[PDB]
Write a protein that binds this ligand. Structure first.
Ligand code: NA
Ligand code: NA
Ligand code: NA
Ligand code: NA
Ligand code: NA
Ligand code: NA
Ligand code: NA
Ligand code: NA
Lengths: 251, 251
């Protein structure tokens, strides 16, 4: 605002769970604000999300970035997280943002499973959200759950187990049952304002076909295929993601 | 079980909210169990739900019936309830039931908005749930939200308000935004085991067309239109609901 600029740890509640976030507060009495969503097993402070928030703040666009339930600093077990209750988290965050009297336009920015949360939240609030940026949006998590193979762990999609050991973690069976039937494109397509789609051609985690499919479903989308980039836009590719996202939201 | 029979208040947790339920425990080491779901602004102990549980217990079929979040004895504000987080409650209850070693087959019984929760939960667990009974299932809540008229309170469906005063209560705007886009028939139609549909011809709250539509979508449904009955199967109509539900679950 006019008097305070910089970072601040902030906390919200959704159904009895605390969610922990970081707010980047820019100069000025009135400013736009992006809500930034991390992906599956990530957190609000990955290099990509930090550099997005930093670049936005340089342009005086505020942002907030929260850990989803079951992630990072927030409450809840990872095993109890699903894409649906992450959309419920995202709605609690949007409650916080849309009632801040300094906030002019609201933008959603989502990476990977956070891109599905962003795209679906924008389709539920198409009258409020002004622009969306999806980075490698993980709409393929539905097709993966239907196949029975979530990033190399396999299971019977017709009889999903109660829980699924997953590296160091335990994935809920209810996450997978929800994933199989999520109306990702149906809900997301209701957002007819500008969308920017950014996907690396060498993403091994989410097929670029996900963004190609979003680009067909949206009324107003621009697709950027970043030649050679991986799922996280790591190292030499990071600035491609950061620049496109910042340029998109500045106008 | 073999040693204890009768009622018991039971408590479960979903995301930091306590849910309060009543278990009817029948005779025998092994028995089937129905999970019974109340409707919008109701509670686990309406006359209809009590008499259903009582009649089932006479047949040695166990049951549990919980207050949804935002209702009755359970945690959470009514304003924060949606059909989606009631499905999340229902999944926490099913976790409890499917891990009880006395439980043989599991049945879902839902009245009104509880019928939508039941039908959608059965479509997410079509491999586990054995039979479903829907009583006046409120699948019309989606069409109502799209129209902008929820039981006589009106609003702009293209720009749903943050909150909607509703009699003595405050309905969340997010309830309505979710309702408009709920994939009720898509998800429910995945359950191909036996379904019993019970609807009163003079229901003024949920059009009988809801059960007529479910009867077309299911692979194995039986439709019972109760001549003259109202939304709650009150007074002289109650036994029509209770008898059909009990007969259905006994075999
Ligand atoms: Na953590
Ligand atoms: Na669907
Ligand atoms: Na376009
Ligand atoms: Na497009
Ligand atoms: Na209460
Ligand atoms: Na749908
Ligand atoms: Na049939
Ligand atoms: Na049928």
């Amino acid at each position: 605002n006019l008097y305070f600029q910089g970072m601040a740890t902030i906390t919200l509640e959704r159904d009895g769970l605390q969610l922990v976030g970081t707010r980047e507060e820019p100069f000025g009495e009135i400013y736009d604000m992006a809500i930034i969503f991390h992906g599956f097993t990530a957190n609000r402070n990955t290099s990509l999300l930090r550099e997005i928030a930093n670049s936005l703040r340089d342009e005086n666009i505020a942002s907030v970035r929260f850990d989803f339930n079951g992630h990072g600093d927030s409450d809840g077990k990872f095993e109890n997280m699903t894409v649906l209750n992450e959309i419920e988290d995202a709605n609690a965050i949007l409650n916080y943002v849309k009632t801040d009297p300094h906030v002019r336009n609201i933008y959603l920015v989502g990476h990977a499973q956070g891109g599905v949360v962003a795209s679906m939240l924008a389709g539920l609030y198409p009258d409020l959200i002004k622009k969306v940026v999806l980075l490698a949006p993980a709409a393929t998590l539905k097709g993966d759950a239907l196949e029975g193979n979530t990033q190399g762990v396999t299971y019977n999609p017709d009889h999903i187990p109660d829980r699924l050991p997953f590296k160091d973690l335990t994935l809920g069976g209810f996450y997978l049952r929800i994933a199989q039937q999520l109306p990702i494109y149906e809900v997301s397509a209701q957002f007819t304002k500008p969308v920017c789609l950014i996907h690396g051609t060498d993403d091994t985690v989410v097929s670029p076909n996900a963004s190609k499919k979003y680009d067909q479903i949206y009324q107003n989308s621009t697709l950027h295929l970043i030649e050679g980039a991986d799922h996280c836009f790591s190292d030499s590719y990071q600035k491609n993601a950061v620049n496109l996202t910042t340029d998109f939201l500045q106008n």
